[PDB]
Amino acid sequence: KEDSEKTRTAILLAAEELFLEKGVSHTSLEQIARAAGVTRGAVYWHFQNKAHLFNEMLNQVRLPPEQLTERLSSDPLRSLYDLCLEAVQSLLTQEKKRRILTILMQRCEFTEELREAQERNNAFVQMFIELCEQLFARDECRVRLHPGMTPRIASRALHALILGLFNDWLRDPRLFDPDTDAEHLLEPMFRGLVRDW
Amino acid sequence: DSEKTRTAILLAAEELFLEKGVSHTSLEQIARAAGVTRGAVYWHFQNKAHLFNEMLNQVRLPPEQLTERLSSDPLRSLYDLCLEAVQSLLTQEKKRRILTILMQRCEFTEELREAQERNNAFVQMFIELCEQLFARDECRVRLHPGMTPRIASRALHALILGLFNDWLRDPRLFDPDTDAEHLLEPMFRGLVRDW
């Protein structure tokens, strides 16, 4: 079904534009259908519900679990830094990601209607946090942490920072330059977590 | 008599925004839930965005109070302020409720432009004050090589914002009371020499 994947992408593209332009809650599957040049039934047929549609949209720009773990498993703690650095820098280099994350963080309310999308988002964040926790917990890495600083806290402090940077920059792109400022924005967190940084 | 009706409305709106999202909440529904006329809501708040703004103000610090706090050691003062900010996620239910609306229950479309602009303004203020604090000769010498006030204030804000955002999405991640010190530690240790 090639004919089928073509209508899927046409819908996601339309929905991306509309969600962005006017918010998820004010966007209906009926308006998406109409903008995609497609029947309301086709949208429902393909995506089942709005929450699921939004998911599928986010997946277009989430890293798969296997790829994360591969990169993190040479100093691991540098790999994590590099991953975080690239994450922040990609805000500029990938428009599609910038558009979709702007929807996620600026154009959408997590009411009952979007519960499925919230749960799967939590799950993905929980995964990243769990992998970092594990990384910091490894004997080779853990000895490098400052006194009283645990893997649990390290992973959460780090994630909050990345999240906050995304959130700040997407609310207001004037705050910094993801390209040239990413290294300096991340520096202090890594310097504060690890001794010999 | 007039302030009593104002708080009744903001309380109702807080409940509804939380329960069903801003977009799906109307001034009518707020009026109804507040036990008040549609006209009273419009009279007191004009429009949604302004209503939401007034709601946020119930829990934002005023500019004068921020500057007062930050102006023996102002770098410690900043830490303490940030620490209290995070810890208040638990100690003030009202703040938790309103910030959960701000970060989890609202979309910034044209309808809410007034609220977005004023929110930006408030974040810009905080960032500007920290930038200024780090820029002071006494504080600036304490920063590591290559670390500027511009970046310091932005790194720090992103952290606080991220912590709020993470915890409100998922309160299981950490305990604002006992974990705040440790979540903030590395940022301050990484920014300032003798921390």
From TrEMBL, chain B:
<dbReference type="InterPro" id="IPR013572">
    <property type="entry name" value="Tscrpt_reg_MAATS_C"/>
</dbReference>
<feature type="domain" description="HTH tetR-type">
    <location>
        <begin position="3"/>
        <end position="63"/>
    </location>
</feature>
<dbReference type="InterPro" id="IPR036271">
    <property type="entry name" value="Tet_transcr_reg_TetR-rel_C_sf"/>
</dbReference>
<dbReference type="Pfam" id="PF00440">
    <property type="entry name" value="TetR_N"/>
</dbReference>
<protein>
    <submittedName>
        <fullName>NalD</fullName>
    </submittedName>
</protein>
<dbReference type="GO" id="GO:0000976">
    <property type="term" value="F:transcription cis-regulatory region binding"/>
</dbReference>
<feature type="DNA-binding region" description="H-T-H motif">
    <location>
        <begin position="26"/>
        <end position="45"/>
    </location>
</feature>
<dbReference type="InterPro" id="IPR001647">
    <property type="entry name" value="HTH_TetR"/>
</dbReference>
<dbReference type="GO" id="GO:0003677">
    <property type="term" value="F:DNA binding"/>
</dbReference>
<dbReference type="InterPro" id="IPR050109">
    <property type="entry name" value="HTH-type_TetR-like_transc_reg"/>
</dbReference>
<dbReference type="GO" id="GO:0051051">
    <property type="term" value="P:negative regulation of transport"/>
</dbReference>
<dbReference type="Pfam" id="PF08361">
    <property type="entry name" value="TetR_C_2"/>
</dbReference>
<dbReference type="GO" id="GO:0034763">
    <property type="term" value="P:negative regulation of transmembrane transport"/>
</dbReference>
<dbReference type="InterPro" id="IPR009057">
    <property type="entry name" value="Homeodomain-like_sf"/>
</dbReference>
<keyword id="KW-0804">Transcription</keyword>
<dbReference type="GO" id="GO:0045892">
    <property type="term" value="P:negative regulation of DNA-templated transcription"/>
</dbReference>
<dbReference type="GO" id="GO:0003700">
    <property type="term" value="F:DNA-binding transcription factor activity"/>
</dbReference>
<keyword id="KW-0238">DNA-binding</keyword>
<keyword id="KW-0678">Repressor</keyword>
<dbReference type="InterPro" id="IPR023772">
    <property type="entry name" value="DNA-bd_HTH_TetR-type_CS"/>
</dbReference>
<dbReference type="GO" id="GO:0006355">
    <property type="term" value="P:regulation of DNA-templated transcription"/>
</dbReference>
<keyword id="KW-0805">Transcription regulation</keyword>
